[PDB]
């Protein structure tokens, strides 16, 4: 995982840093509630920052969890960490996703914090909840924020309240009344967004139009989802969704007719300040999978993408968000965008943004978790044109130097033809780096401009193809990246099919 690329700008210990930087809580021992690439990038990013600040890569100790599997396969993440605690094997609910387990190990060590990144319990509000109730910090939003955010039903009411365009759904039109105190959606208004039976489901279904999606809020992970295309199928489809994720609330939402998928990168401290770090473009997908990703998103006019940025920050500030998160939008060929959801966690394609904005996200996460306020994070100060170590307040809303992304990035999701994660090296192109977890992986390419970004990524995939387990699986990526349609960044993405 890439960590990036006279006075004394260093302290002697976490303690001094917390004190010196307006911090309010010292975290020097962290438990990583995850494994694989997530566990690797978390350590690498933080340790890079630890070295820059303490001239000691180990200043922030790490304790990881190891299932009898990862352990036997010799996952690299195991020897990297400072301490590791062996955990039960089997599905994640017996480990990396078992919340009681995490807080239990978190308490016994003890650590001052936990990081889960993405996957597993990363989005389960009961984790930060149980952690705080035992005085263990969380490198992610507080349970209140995720609560106040809720599932799609709740968050959509909130986007709507804040007047953010949304796709027509069973809850279209619902809002709540809106100094402090985060927003909350009444249990009664929430139910007005669901559907209890085929009777009322069909009702709303007619008001929305076909085709549409039948989705269970508790659903997710390939479950609790269906595509209704006619009133003659709604009944069986709706009952299908019921039998798959029983008891779950269900809602309907219009099926977006092939548009762009844009993301906004949010970063917020524990004081009310939240900023955007440009966004990502992930309109290229192969069967519900983000294959190729861009950064920033150029497809959309800076004026319109900047507005999405503001709404996103608004949305975040309202739920009292903390740390990093993603707000997904749906930009249309003409100029219409709709809020889709907010990711209460860091994503795997984050290195894109780290690359165009020079921000070490996991390190930001850790400093915010110690109470350091945005204007006191070196990476942000620099991004805002300020002093690397000044104490000066930064006006994020109306900055004197509106940050500009440095370059363009391309990200490709790759697949194969001891260890769990393999770091990739390229003698060919030099603005590319990647990893491969053994199954899937990612490659990140930097370029002075989009052209060079695409170019480099390609020359890299080719070097990649020399590898045995990569003689075919990445061929279509190269062909795809070289297609003229992609070359000119056509607003239309249809061409992805007849490839």
From Swiss-Prot:
Binding-site residues for Mn(2+) 1, renumbered to this chain: 328, 341
Function: Mitochondrial enzyme that catalyzes the carboxylation of acetyl-CoA to malonyl-CoA and plays a central role in fatty acid metabolism. Catalyzes a 2 steps reaction starting with the ATP-dependent carboxylation of the biotin carried by the biotin carboxyl carrier (BCC) domain followed by the transfer of the carboxyl group from carboxylated biotin to acetyl-CoA. Through the production of malonyl-CoA that allosterically inhibits carnitine palmitoyltransferase 1 at the mitochondria, negatively regulates fatty acid oxidation.
Domain spans labelled ATP-grasp: 179-370
Binding site for Mn(2+) 2: 341, 343
Residues annotated to bind Mg(2+) 2: 341, 343
Result when mutating residue 44 to A: Loss of regulation of oligomerization by phosphorylation at S-3
Record note on domains: Consists of an N-terminal biotin carboxylation/carboxylase (BC) domain that catalyzes the ATP-dependent transient carboxylation of the biotin covalently attached to the central biotinyl-binding/biotin carboxyl carrier (BCC) domain. The C-terminal carboxyl transferase (CT) domain catalyzes the transfer of the carboxyl group from carboxylated biotin to acetyl-CoA to produce malonyl-CoA.
Subunit structure: Monomer, homodimer, and homotetramer. Forms filamentous polymers. Interacts with MID1IP1; interaction with MID1IP1 promotes oligomerization and increases its activity in a citrate-dependent manner.
Positions annotated to bind Mg(2+) 1: 328, 341
Positions where Phosphothreonine occurs in the chain: 493
Residue ranges annotated for the Biotin carboxylation domain, each copy included: 26-499
Domain of life of the organism encoding this protein: Eukaryota
Name of the protein described by the UniProt record: Acetyl-CoA carboxylase 2
Posttranslational mods: The biotin cofactor is covalently attached to the central biotinyl-binding domain and is required for the catalytic activity.
Applications (biotechnology): Inhibition of ACACB may prevent lipid-induced insulin resistance and type 2 diabetes, making the enzyme a potential pharmaceutical target for treatment of obesity and type 2 diabetes.
Active site residues of this protein: 345
Chain sites annotated for binding ATP: 219-224
Residues modified to Phosphoserine: 1, 3, 230
Tissue: Widely expressed with highest levels in heart, skeletal muscle, liver, adipose tissue, mammary gland, adrenal gland and colon. Isoform 3 is expressed in skeletal muscle, adipose tissue and liver (at protein level). Isoform 3 is detected at high levels in adipose tissue with lower levels in heart, liver, skeletal muscle and testis.
Subcellular localization: Mitochondrion
